[PDB]
Scaffold this active site. Sequence first.
Site, PDB file in Angstrom:
ATOM      1  N   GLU A   1      -1.645  -8.808   1.673  1.00  0.00           N
ATOM      2  CA  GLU A   1      -3.002  -8.538   1.215  1.00  0.00           C
ATOM      3  C   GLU A   1      -4.023  -9.444   1.888  1.00  0.00           C
ATOM      4  O   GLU A   1      -5.146  -9.003   2.165  1.00  0.00           O
ATOM      5  CB  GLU A   1      -3.072  -8.669  -0.308  1.00  0.00           C
TER       6      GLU A   1
ATOM      7  N   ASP B   1       3.811   0.799   6.106  1.00  0.00           N
ATOM      8  CA  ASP B   1       2.666   0.762   7.009  1.00  0.00           C
ATOM      9  C   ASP B   1       2.901   1.626   8.240  1.00  0.00           C
ATOM     10  O   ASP B   1       1.989   2.322   8.697  1.00  0.00           O
ATOM     11  CB  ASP B   1       2.381  -0.681   7.404  1.00  0.00           C
TER      12      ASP B   1
END
Lengths: 500, 142, 49, 432, 234, 186, 370, 125
Positions: G97, G178
């Site tokens: 993050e 991802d």
Amino acid sequence: PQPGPSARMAILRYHAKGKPLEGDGQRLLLKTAEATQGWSAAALANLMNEAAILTVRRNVPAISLPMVLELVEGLNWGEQAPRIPDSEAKDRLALITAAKAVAFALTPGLEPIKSVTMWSGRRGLGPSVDFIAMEDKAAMDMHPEETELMGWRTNFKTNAAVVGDEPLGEFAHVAGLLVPLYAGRAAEVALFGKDGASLATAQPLADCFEIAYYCVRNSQVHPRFKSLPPLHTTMWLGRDDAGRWRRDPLAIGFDEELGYHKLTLTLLKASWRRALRLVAQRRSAITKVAAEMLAAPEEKITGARLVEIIESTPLDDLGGEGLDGAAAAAVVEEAGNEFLPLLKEVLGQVPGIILTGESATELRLDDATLAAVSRTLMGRLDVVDLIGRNTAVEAAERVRDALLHPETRERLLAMRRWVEGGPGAPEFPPSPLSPEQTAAMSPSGPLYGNLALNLDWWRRRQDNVISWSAMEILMSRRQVDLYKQDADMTEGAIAKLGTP
Amino acid sequence: RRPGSFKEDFFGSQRDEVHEKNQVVYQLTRHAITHYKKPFKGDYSLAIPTNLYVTDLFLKLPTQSISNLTNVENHNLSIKNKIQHFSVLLLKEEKRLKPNKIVEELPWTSLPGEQLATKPRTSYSVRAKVAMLAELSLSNLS
Amino acid sequence: LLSFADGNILDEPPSPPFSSLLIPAKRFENYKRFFRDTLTGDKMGQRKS
Amino acid sequence: GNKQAKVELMEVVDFFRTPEKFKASGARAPKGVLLVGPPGNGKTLMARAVAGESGVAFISSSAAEFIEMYMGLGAARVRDLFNTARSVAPCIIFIDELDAVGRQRQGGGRSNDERDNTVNQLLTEMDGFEAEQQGIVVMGATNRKDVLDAALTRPGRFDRSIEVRRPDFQGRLEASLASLMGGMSGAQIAGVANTACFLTLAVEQAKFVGAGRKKRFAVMEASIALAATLLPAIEPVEYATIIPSTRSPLGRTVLKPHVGRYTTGVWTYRYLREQLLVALAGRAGEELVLGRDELSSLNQHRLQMARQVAWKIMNSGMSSHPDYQHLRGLGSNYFDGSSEPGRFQQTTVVMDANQTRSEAVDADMEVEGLLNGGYKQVFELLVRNRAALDALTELLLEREKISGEEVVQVVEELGHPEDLARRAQWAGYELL
Amino acid sequence: AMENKTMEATLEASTAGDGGGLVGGEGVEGSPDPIPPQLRRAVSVYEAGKALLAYITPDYEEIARVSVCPLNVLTGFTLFVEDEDKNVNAILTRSELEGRMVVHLAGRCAEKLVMGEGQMTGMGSPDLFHANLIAREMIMSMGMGRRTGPIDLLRVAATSDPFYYHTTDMSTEQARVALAEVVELLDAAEAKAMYGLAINWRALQALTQALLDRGTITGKEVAHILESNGVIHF
Amino acid sequence: ALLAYITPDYEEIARVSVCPLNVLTGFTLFVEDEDKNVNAILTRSELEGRMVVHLAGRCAEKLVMGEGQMTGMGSPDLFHANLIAREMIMSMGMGRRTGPIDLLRVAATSDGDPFYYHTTDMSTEQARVALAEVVELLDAAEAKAMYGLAINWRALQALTQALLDRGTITGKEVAHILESNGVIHF
Amino acid sequence: PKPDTEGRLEILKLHLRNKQVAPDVDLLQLARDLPGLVGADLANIVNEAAMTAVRSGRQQLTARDIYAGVDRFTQGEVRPSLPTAHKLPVLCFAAKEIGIALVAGELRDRYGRVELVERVSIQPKGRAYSRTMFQRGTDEEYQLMTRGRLLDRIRLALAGGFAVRTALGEETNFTAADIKRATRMAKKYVFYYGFSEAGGAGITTWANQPYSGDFVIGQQRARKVVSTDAMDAFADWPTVSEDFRFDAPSPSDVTWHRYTDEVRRVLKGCSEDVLGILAERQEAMWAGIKALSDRKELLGSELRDIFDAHPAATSRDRDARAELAAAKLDMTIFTEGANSRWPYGIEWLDDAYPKPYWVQQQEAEAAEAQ
Amino acid sequence: STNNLLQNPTNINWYYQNRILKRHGQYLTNQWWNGQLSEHNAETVFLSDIDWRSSFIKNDGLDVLLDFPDTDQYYNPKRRRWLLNNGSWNFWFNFDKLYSEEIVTTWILESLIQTYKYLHKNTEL
């Protein structure tokens, strides 16, 4: 069940009572019973009723056949539909339809053309070429499968195409269908150019390939694969539950090696050249058919008038540069379709052949003898461009090898005579290279017992080195050397027999 | 047994935050790689590929490799069926369901209305046959 | 346990058992018509339907 | 008005009240009318007018109201309605929305038993052992020609297939204006008239955007209109607008349609190449004006249209490949029956026999070359007509709806001399 | 009880209709009741190799128990205990994946070294497929390939004839490169497994004999045997 | 019909029709006996005889009309002969080079054909060896059919003339014609 | 018609008409950041914000109670926190993050297309362990997908996995999700939208147009929230009509190799940019990771202060320059230079495909004739 | 009819009745369209309340139906795993075939040879 023809006659005769029918009512009932196939009894009662509901707004004293056919078309097609508005694209569509109709009429072995129209009913349809139907094949009493009979029939004429003493094979008969489908594109290319090609003539080109693929692969009447060992290269073993087909497990590289795609392309290119020649030679005929269709009361011409136009209009010169357009002058590209010049060319290499034509031994062979042997072995003489020059050369070699043996040559002449028939047929052909001394060599008396051995004892070809490709196993060394430029392979086609 | 990667790939669908999607992917990856022959976590789960390989190895007849033939899909087979599933008896068997078969083609001039009103649409319309097969498959699913 | 997508469409969406999209089946019917009238045939032994 | 159905309605009222000539000619009676057509063209109004002309009663009913959860109630209602019809002697029976009940009695589901009972009751009331006969006509209204039962559409129950559609030029005259509001039904015509009374702005309304998206719309539509004007076989622009509709959120440029091409299907190879150019024009102009990094998803359907044109060129036997030039398409070419009659969908099957492994790569390379060379050609055309592109962009930003004459004027005053000479060379010709 | 649950779970996936071999000791066709000495020697060697190479691999799941033929099943079973607080239920590192590949190839490498190349049985097939699965997910899914790089190539199409689970649509050249990377990862894992089993040959033989004598064994006895026989750690 | 008559242990000919009611077709029927073979054991001599009988029609067409006058009417018979050859090579292990390997199995469908074939995906080398055996077998069958037509040329001429004259001929009349004009059984 | 923007502002003002609101809570940003929600959920959000303020022992100051009230119903419930035993999970579910927020800030610089980061949580609240919330920009910025916007989205996708890799010095399974997202976005970039250079102008011969949701049937009722769906389905126009669906012929293996090579080129460029950013901002990333581990939840404001307080060290010159070096990928682009005519770096292609006609035209008209 | 050995020497009637009488004796006047319509794409023109297709085109009168065709479908289920064509025929992953067959035939031959060698010495038995 649904009423048949006689039931149709009875129902229309019963329901026609109380109504005025113009002229002879029997002819009107005959036509409206021929033209209402599949109809129900209530449908016929309605059609009879609706005719009498008419002749009030139109103020006709009696029911007539054109109005009856008008309601017959109306109750199953809906609106009468308007004709195509006049335009330059409409003139091009008339030209395309005229070229298609002319090539349909010039195609040997086809059914007679009933009518070629520019104006039709319904919504998504335009110009059409309608052929004769059952109600037409009845009157001129003709076999229903006359289209299938058109191959082997000789010395006949349909539409504008004549067939002489040599019958059309299945290969030439189905390969003759490619020219009407290519004629729509050929007219635009010959008269306008590459940019003149439109979407109007695009649907027949996509079916040309499947017709030619049947001709060269599935039909098994291609002259290249007739001399092969009797192996089925197009097998599919069953369909199975959930409908999943299974290819023959041995068919690894069969289509690529046997050159099916390149032979299909050869047939399609030859048919395109034939269509270009047809449009070149019948350019004035196509223009006249288009003009007569454009200046017709219902924008419709008949088959007899189309044939009359084709025969009356003289053959245009295929030369003269562009054929109302340009770059199609290539049409002068000889033809290369006759097997007799190729055979004479091949026989010229053999010393002491002495060819005369329609007249080491001298071997004074005539054109009749050459044509008979070629028709017996190769099959036909005017399909060389369709089958390929390599196939024609292999056939010429086979015909030469048969002509060098007098016994084989005389047997071939005699069986050609029996196939042709006529008063000159000398009954059944002679013994199939097994004389009376070799047939008396083994009845149930002397020798015998060799036919009792299993099939492996009849194995006349045996090679201990099996090749990596199926063409080497199937075809002979000369056949692989002559072919294999038609194979769909990268550089295997230099690693395959006749090594340089 | 009581019954997602095709919806987000083909139909757009979405409706899943990119954090919970990532958490699901991480947990599925850990469950696929680890959790094999675990006491209670990898018991029977069909998400572990090695359990499926074990079932294939111990219950199926070999594996069979890829064919070298043309006009076939991978093996010596065509493509799968896409959608999976007196006179009275004669008519009932003549027109009952028609699953696999092959759909006929109508002429471009079509058939005159009566003959079109016979010969059921499943026999010629392709779209109608596929819609019927879809309706039966969804009825069996529901 | 790994396919390589040999002889099928690249991106074929799921079908009525999973989705409600009839496009792959509509193309599959014409594929079957192709498999009938240029090879295999109606019955074993027929050269074309 | 009401298409050509008024003659049939006259016939209906004539044999209803005063047969005379029909009895002299020997005709007995029509016994059914099936009004086929979309709603909004006065389908019930025509039957009301027929009943008023014949001097008979009218009872409003629809087939949906017969659908009742009590078994046998719909068949009982149909039987009762026909019994009161026979008691009235004569009248006209109207059944509306027959596509909700009379559809394909094949069985399946616990909702169609009573529906099949109602269809069988209608079948035995319209026909069957003669119990009505007389001068009784039953009218039904459907939106489709033949979706009902074979017995229901049989020409002994509904033997008149009277069809109505949207009004034509004279019909819209009866109910310069018809040029503007041509192509919709009478209900929408009345709604347009009511909106105009409430306010020809109603026609435009019946037929929000910031600065950046408005500029992108103006650039895209200006590029498309400039390419359509400059290319010869492409038809002249009818109008161009950047105001999004309720279902077209990108602005549209509409050309003047070619009657001959649309009627005859003569779509030439040169027209297809220039149509590929016109399809790539929006992407080319957007890239040229706003830079490459501002390429947007606005051309996601223009790219699909360009791929359609290129693959149709390949599939129509117009490619430059020697094995594909004037011989073949992509293969197979099977056809399917679409929704409306006369409409067919084309499906092409390419399986290892219609194509070789190198021919597949050749076809893909040719399509890629067609698309990319067309993009380069359009980019060069818009580069050399940058002043005209900019002027069209600012005019579109000012007016938001320009006509084709303004586009032609801007192009002819600010165009490249070579493109103008090409346009003047290939002018006049209706291009086949 | 935990071992019995795991073995019962595998047995109700490897007998559902025919089965074979995996459930030995049944008195029926594919199941001899006295598990033969060669077969139990192979199972003991397999499980001893797996236990030894899970012991000498640092930061691995630790061994709770090691059993030879649980539930009369013709394979061994090592009870591995995970640390949930270490890497929750979401984290996998390349060290953990490569160590798992080595440990899963360890049993078949040990039985190949001891019993010979030709006497290796088929009980190493699920572990070999699991190591191949880890390598395939590293190359084609996690994007840990040097030449393949970060691209998603696997699109799971089990949707539940030859039973494909994974399914990929990439080109033949990219498939060749990716499968070459998978093969080289499997070769590296097999080489490391054989290296560990070779340098700890005496400890492997002692663990094999202990498994033969005791049938089942615990983590502390495994550690005591390996540390008493002079083990070499990775 | 001639090769089916002279082939030992073959089915009796029921009716030979050549365009029976002016319909473009031609067939040679056989009686469907419920005794004898059914499904007990398929001898390689029986299978070779069936394959020769299947190839006999196209061999007769070649030997009488020529190579170029043959048409594709013999395609189902050629399919059945090829199926017999492939079955012998790949299902019964009758080939010396392929050996006893089960590469092809038959199955019955639960319309089209009443049966399909389970196929094993072979490699190029195995497929080429099996194809060489199948081609040798089929060429040998063609040679045997040609010789069987050659030693019975008068019988073939008589049967062809009778078929041309009469159209549809019963199998009893076929046997009478062949035995009257002189035939040599295999 | 669900309320939105001004209607959501009116609903929030109606439900906050009797409660004191601190000025730091942006009502407009909260309304724009909660799309598709109705009053029957905003009432619960204001209710839980009030109860969290009451349980906090103070008045309704700061935005953290409002964000907790939003999170309680957008990402329902509160799971137990990540364990403090071992340094692996606290590092991974902070590094991903932190790297996503850092890459978002860096792409907000220079380009400006990427919206600002609202907050990063790393406290598990339902079906997830960590989050990064993005301050949803105004609508009409999502009604159209731009090439630069899609490139920034691909970079933001790859950012979390490459940040975990940069923190640990090791590849993890965090790159799998991802990669799964970025490959789909790159395929949409290359094929459908045509933003690439495939073929020289970016127009490929094949594109997979998305279908409608009406074929989903199941339609799992997640409800509310509305994630990156708001950017994905808004610019895409699906099919909806099977009668007018264009799918194109499926491309051959060679052109599929070229197109997937273009996809790999796009992914390699975005990945190298992300790795360069994360290599040059290692100090800021580590400071953000430490702040995240110390304070659990953290706002995008304070993250911007931390990243400004730890800027890049100008030029790393040496040693630290070796992190920027070898941060490029070794992944293979097959059709890079001379391998873009016909073999395309394939040694077996000439042994399988027999030299297409346009290939011969390329090698004869262009090559050997210049 | 179900006799699976009937002789059909030609199939010209199939093409005449299925590709000429059914298909190519007629012509379809719906092939293409402008591409620039009044409602974005042809799907949105089709799914509209206004019958855009029928349009009053003075430039005499009339309402000539300007129709657009349905989107043509292309089915391309070709094989894309071609690996080796020069020297042998091999698709992409068939590497486990030569080893498999050369083990199967070798093992079967060895077992048959062992059986023959055993039974060669027990013929009297």
